Design a binder for this molecule. Structure first.
Ligand code: HEM
Ligand code: HEM
Ligand SMILES: CNCc1cc(C#N)cc(OCc2ccc3c(C)cc(N)nc3c2)c1
Ligand SMILES: CNCc1cc(C#N)cc(OCc2ccc3c(C)cc(N)nc3c2)c1
Ligand SMILES: CNCc1cc(C#N)cc(OCc2ccc3c(C)cc(N)nc3c2)c1
Ligand SMILES: C[C@H](O)[C@H](O)[C@H]1CNc2nc(N)[nH]c(=O)c2N1
Ligand SMILES: C[C@H](O)[C@H](O)[C@H]1CNc2nc(N)[nH]c(=O)c2N1
Ligand SMILES: [Zn+2]
Lengths: 413, 409
């Protein structure tokens, strides 16, 4: 593995040199003979597995605070060791928890928003014991992060995994999302992405309003127990109705979206410890709602209706009526959020910020893992600076990881 | 092992076995993915095994693997390598090899067409004049009055490296670009360096916005010579818009025939350093990349002004709006002039169909997502949600260094 790897930006001719990749921990899935960079994803750690994972992390932490090789570093290593020796696990100090969380985000190769990585409110919920307790923590998270539209990024971290049979999980994939319902005629009402989860909620007791934008209940599992239902107080759920600055008819589609993107099904991995419930949130890039959430065929799929109202020729694809429609929808989204003073970033701004962030990281850190397939926005790719930017992808730790859906593993009590 | 790729829109799962035949490197490792790097990473001793592998698959493709003819061919090639340090492809092999180079081009969304490829054998060429004759014939055949037909012209293979045939142009047809004293760029900024080389070599530039470059042709390692393609062979399309009558006043145009002339074709260990190949355009190639790149024509501003868009904030999406109109214009103009062109929706759709065909009849299809996904409206095309496996099969087209960094005059 070569000490230096060069990436080039093909628009600016800027060449950057990556050394950070030498700290790569896990595999990517790619080999010498195959690249899997477009694959979406390519009981517990034993004592002997745990030791070097923890030491690697503790060393990295003390190196970060410029106390590497210090008495404090050496003592902490010893304390972590004895703890793993007598309990087969260990507890992170608060400082270490906060550092690990920030760094999992800093290391998230698919995240274009990482320039903000060091500004992350970390909520320590490691004392939580019940789903009601989880509910309380999540509400406080939602309220803090929402901040009346002036969104602040944040993460709440619940107790780490122990034996694997006492996991804490948020069964929701996001804290806030809209229900989808399959109708007997095969049609779908609400968000088609959410049909299975909605179905689980209904089975667990949830009475669905059966509308187009029903906010789902939280489905919360504590200490390996059966998950429990809770309704988020509506006044904590900031929403933005979607209208257009030129098209007066746009509001008549009755679209709206929630302001707070809060992903809740991922696993936070720090120094070998596994945090199976660690909901984190930031603010939206417009395209996430306007291209994917609205215009994906497997989603709300409104390109057609907008095109109709725009009186476009929808007979030939080469009229580009879809492309035209896609733009206007994204314009509506950005305008609607800005009008209501709810934080949102357009894809041009986000991508330019990312390029600057990447350059800075190459300078202060020796690199910045980035997944081009995910970094480039789902519309207008080549007119954003990341399109022409060569990137290196690799997995650093701490990191956020996928985990199986809990209904597939849970032992019902 | 066997690998699965999933389409997340249709849930279709395909199984790849073809990658097990891959012999070349991708540039990645278990620890580092280089999928977005543009270019990552003979002798008798190495030559025969490469030749064998190819001859083997050729005879395999015609259901005659291990035939007397197969064995005879292997023996013939061996002796030919012994007594001359190289070997020559049969016409059949040449045609098979070229089609398969296209077939294996992971970055090409147009590969549904791979077996319709007119192969011009130019291996008897000895001079720049010969090359020019061949290239004019290629262009006239491929253009076909607007009904474009894919073609490749293959010049003699490399011998010792000192006698290479090279087409110095990156494409057969391109517009020049000129560095203006006031710092800017007239014409096409992609071609500033090449243009200067042509000027330095005797070319008299008209200094317009759309000057067709001369061919700069190198034969048998000698210095390159200049030729002007007869204009009646160069099909062009004036760009206008079906709604915006002002669009034609921008005075934009483009050439009908995309013909890449700077890559290397490799077959059975042999290297063809001059092998211009051509197809027809996907609209975005012109309308997004050629016109709207910052390091290219960069006319987004101009079009956005004429649309009376607010260009003060990026969040107005004025660039995106202008981008779609430019691409509508490109498609409309070509279609109106009955010049073959494909939109990115139609193209990506066809590619999905092609992948299904390849998985069925070949056990897979190497594909580079980073390149297959179009440079606009990504996720509203079916390829965006389609998992792809990228791997390198041979025969293949490869990058090679620009000749003005290797040549001694
Ligand atoms: C502050 C504003 C933020 C913006 C604008 C932003 C933007 C994005 C976008 C556009 C994506 C791709 C989303 C998709 O296509 O599904 C993404 C992915 C991701 N983000 Fe960020 N994000 C932000 C905050 C955060 C925070 C606070 C964290 C963690 C602490 C985070 C971690 C991640 C991770 C782990 C992924 C990849 C998930 C996967 O592999 O599926 N982001 N982000
Ligand atoms: C017939 C219609 C064709 C269409 C619509 C088409 C389309 C495309 C497009 C859009 C690209 C991406 C290029 C870029 O954005 O820079 C590409 C790449 C490529 N095409 Fe095709 N193509 C066609 C025919 C052909 C033919 C006839 C050949 C060769 C015999 C070919 C070989 C290649 C190769 C080797 C690349 C990638 C070059 C690289 O690795 O940089 N294509 N094609
Ligand atoms: C003795 N210190 C001065 C020194 C001299 C020379 C010389 N001449 C080369 C040096 O490289 C150090 C180094 C360290 C790590 C490396 C890794 C992980 C990978 C890799 N491919 N190369 C590496 C090279 C250092
Ligand atoms: C379902 N699509 C694949 C997918 C799967 C999983 C999993 N498991 C998680 C995914 O998270 C993307 C993400 C995560 C956090 C984000 C934050 C904080 C802000 C923001 N604007 N966008 C974000 C996007 C996406
Ligand atoms: C400059 N950008 C990277 C780049 C480098 C090189 C090299 N060396 C060649 C490139 O050609 C891509 C290509 C090749 C053939 C094509 C054909 C036949 C048809 C078509 N519609 N599009 C095509 C696009 C692009
Ligand atoms: C950095 C990146 O790999 C580079 O800009 C690539 C990305 N995808 C592309 N895709 C196509 N079709 N053509 C290109 O030139 C590029 N450029
Ligand atoms: C098949 C492909 O990897 C998949 O659809 C990816 C492509 N790139 C993406 N990029 C982002 N930001 N989000 C996504 O969901 C996807 N989906
Ligand atoms: Zn890879």
């Amino acid at each position: 593995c070569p000490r230096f790897l060069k990436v080039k930006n093909w628009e600016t001719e800027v060449v950057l040199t990556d050394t950070l990749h030498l700290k790569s921990t896990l595999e990517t899935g790619c080999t010498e003979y195959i690249c899997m960079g477009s694959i979406m994803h390519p009981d517990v750690a034993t004592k002997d597995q745990l030791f070097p994972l923890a030491k690697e992390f503790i060393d990295q932490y003390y190196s970060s605070i410029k106390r590497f090789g210090s008495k404090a570093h050496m003592e902490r290593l010893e304390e972590v060791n004895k703890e793993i020796d007598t309990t087969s696990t260990y507890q992170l100090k608060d400082t270490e928890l906060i550092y690990g969380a920030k760094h999992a985000w800093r290391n998230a190769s698919r995240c274009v928003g990482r320039i903000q990585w060091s500004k992350l409110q970390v909520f320590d919920a490691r004392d939580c014991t019940t789903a009601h307790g989880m509910f309380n923590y999540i509400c406080n998270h939602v309220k803090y992060a929402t901040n009346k539209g002036n969104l602040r990024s944040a993460i709440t971290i619940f107790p780490q995994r122990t034996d694997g049979k006492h996991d804490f999980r948020v069964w929701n994939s996001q804290l806030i999302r809209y229900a989808g319902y399959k109708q007997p005629d095969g049609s779908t009402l609400g968000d088609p992405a959410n049909v299975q989860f909605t179905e689980i909620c209904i089975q667990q007791g949830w009475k669905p309003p059966r509308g187009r934008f029903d906010v789902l209940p939280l489905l919360l599992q504590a200490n390996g127990n059966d998950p429990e239902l809770f309704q988020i107080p509506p006044e904590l759920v900031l929403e933005v109705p979607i209208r257009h600055p030129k098209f007066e008819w746009f509001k008549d589609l009755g679209l709206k979206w929630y302001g707070l993107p809060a992903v809740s099904n991922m696993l936070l991995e720090i120094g070998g410890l596994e945090f199976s419930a660690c909901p984190f949130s930031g603010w939206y890039m417009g395209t996430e709602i306007g291209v994917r959430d609205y215009c994906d065929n497997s989603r709300y799929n409104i390109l057609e209706e907008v095109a109709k109202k725009m009186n476009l020729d929808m007979r030939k694809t080469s009229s580009l009526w879809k492309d035209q429609a896609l733009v206007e929808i994204n314009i509506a989204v950005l305008y609607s959020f800005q009008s209501d003073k709810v934080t949102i970033v357009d894809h041009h701004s986000a991508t330019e910020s990312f390029i600057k962030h990447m350059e800075n990281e190459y300078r202060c850190r020796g690199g910045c893992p980035a997944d081009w397939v995910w970094i480039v926005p789902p519309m207008s790719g080549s007119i954003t600076p990341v399109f022409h930017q060569e990137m290196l992808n690799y997995r650093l730790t701490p990191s956020f990881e996928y985990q199986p859906d809990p209904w597939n593993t849970h032992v019902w009590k």
